[PDB]
Write a protein that binds this ligand. Structure first.
Ligand SMILES: [N]C1=N[C]=NC2=C1N=[C]N2[C]1O[C]([C]OP([O])(=O)OP([O])([O])=O[P-](=O)([O-])[O-])[C]([O])[C]1[O]
Ligand SMILES: OC[C@@H]1O[C@@](O)(CO)[C@H](O)[C@H]1O
Length: 479
């Protein structure tokens, strides 16, 4: 009567297969890691790609571990990073490469769309922020640059539905992730004909987007009992938001991993000129609650520094970085130059030098620059979001692997001047589990699931410190 649900959560820098054990009567929810694996960009034939075959093998390995253990799997669900897709021919073989959102193939195409279609027009139709690697632009790149591939394409599946298909033999187009494409009309929740026309994609490559909770198909443990594969809020950030223990309308979220996604939830989208000017997104959420948010380049910058400087003790780095004075190096992390530079440290240093700032050079200085520059951007965006909705926030919920960074947690609470509640760490995994339980009739809605998370997970309070260095710095920039 306890349910065993397996969540697959694939992020840009890691993948995980996790097993939840849940039972309603007890309000007890546990999560065990079954298989954790690396994920990352691969340079393949002049492209930045995903190794989807290794990802599938990793997923199967995790699933088969649970099976060989003799556990009764009640359901499986898959969430991944947004925007990206896999093209398939009529027989289900991949067409072309699985190109990553960090690929430069899209360069220039967002501007071209704004010029040809109208910036305001794309925004009012999609309600989605302008990011140069949005699916809208990737499909333009594909169809413009690889016209020979086009006749072979029968279907495009977004990443989570791709793996769900590889498990079930059934195709799905999950709503929350479809919204990341900047191809879904915000008023119809279906593909926008005009945006598809510009992208060169064909509507027949897709299906009407379907809200999470449906059973996509079934998977088979090598013995042969049918395990339902459920369509969850398959956009990782959508899952992370479900698991954020939001307490009513004055709570915001910060989903912190490779990206930092900072936002709130709304029953209605914001596509006004205020929203457009701020480049705010209205991503699809479970229950139709829009995730009104902004992308922030996030810990990606630090991931790259760690590789370049060959730093393998992140906790030590954070500890060292706490000793450094704050706010002497400030970059704008959202600057396009940081999406995928060949030389991350060099790019950071150039950006600082261009502003007549001291140059961050030590490992700890580069991390200090990153953490301070994120926190100042956190404060800017949180202000923009409050201004937009016309309602303050009383708490910021930070979730994701980034919520383990106690330094950044405090800088965020200090810069924003808001209480920060950090946790759960694996929020995307938990939200993935939450949706499965709802399909299993074990759980009634998101708000009920948040009560489970809030009484189950480790939640750590960071109280804003008004006399902090960054508080001092921010107070000063106000006037
Ligand atoms: N220990 C510790 N401390 C602090 N910090 C940290 C740790 N670990 C880790 N970390 C962080 O996190 C991150 C990652 O996160 P996640 O959430 O897992 O991410 P992903 O998912 O992979 O991403 P996306 O994009 O998918 O969201 C790392 O980097 C660090 O920083
Ligand atoms: O898809 C690319 C970016 O990756 C995320 O899904 C985080 O993993 C963001 O929400 C999306 O903007």
């Amino acid at each position: 009567t306890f349910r065993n649900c397996v969540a697959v959560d694939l992020g840009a820098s890691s993948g995980r297969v996790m097993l939840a054990r849940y039972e309603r009567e007890c309000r007890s929810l546990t999560l065990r890691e079954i298989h954790r694996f690396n994920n990352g960009l691969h340079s393949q034939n002049g492209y930045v790609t995903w190794d989807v075959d290794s990802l599938e093998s990793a997923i199967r390995l995790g699933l088969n571990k649970v099976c060989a253990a003799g556990i009764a799997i009640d359901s499986i669900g898959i969430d991944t990073w947004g925007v990206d897709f896999v093209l398939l021919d009529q027989q289900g073989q991949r067409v072309g490469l699985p190109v990553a959102y960090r690929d430069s193939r899209t360069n220039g195409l967002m501007a071209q769309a704004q010029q040809q279609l109208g910036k305001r027009d794309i925004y009012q139709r999609s309600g989605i922020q302008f990011l140069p690697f949005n699916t809208l632009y990737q499909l333009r790149a594909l169809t413009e640059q690889q016209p020979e591939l086009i006749p072979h394409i029968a279907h495009a599946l977004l990443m989570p539905d791709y793996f769900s298909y590889r498990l079930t033999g059934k195709m799905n187009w999950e709503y929350t992730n479809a919204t990341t494409t900047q191809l879904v009309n915000i008023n119809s929740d279906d593909w926008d004909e005009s945006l598809l026309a510009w992208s060169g994609a064909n509507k027949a490559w897709f299906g009407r987007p379907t809200h999470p909770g449906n059973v996509i198909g079934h998977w088979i443990c090598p013995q042969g009992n049918e395990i339902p594969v459920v369509a969850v809020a398959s956009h990782d950030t959508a899952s992370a938001v479900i698991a954020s223990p939001l307490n009513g309308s004055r709570a915001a979220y910060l989903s912190s991993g490779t990206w930092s996604l900072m936002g709130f939830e709304s029953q209605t989208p914001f596509t006004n000129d205020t929203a457009l000017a701020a480049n705010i997104t209205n991503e699809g959420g479970a229950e139709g609650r829009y995730r009104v948010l902004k992308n922030i380049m996030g810990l990606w910058l630090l991931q790259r520094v760690l590789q370049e400087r060959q730093i393998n003790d992140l906790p030590a780095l954070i500890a060292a970085t706490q000793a450094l004075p704050a706010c002497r190096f400030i970059i704008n992390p959202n600057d396009d130059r940081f999406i995928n530079p060949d030389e991350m440290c060099s790019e950071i240093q150039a950006a600082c030098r261009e502003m007549a700032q001291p140059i961050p050079e030590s490992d700890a200085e580069l991390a200090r620059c990153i953490f301070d520059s994120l926190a100042l951007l956190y404060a800017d965006v949180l202000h923009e979001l409050a201004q937009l909705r016309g309602e303050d926030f009383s708490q910021l919920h930070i979730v994701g692997g980034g919520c383990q960074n106690t330094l950044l947690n405090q800088l965020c609470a200090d810069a924003c001047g808001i209480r920060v509640i950090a946790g759960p760490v694996e929020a995307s995994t938990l939200g993935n589990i939450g949706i499965q339980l709802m399909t299993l009739d074990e759980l009634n809605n998101v708000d009920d699931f948040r009560q489970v998370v809030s009484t189950t997970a480790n939640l750590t309070t960071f109280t804003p410190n008004p006399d902090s260095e960054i508080a001092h710095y921010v107070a000063l920039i106000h006037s």
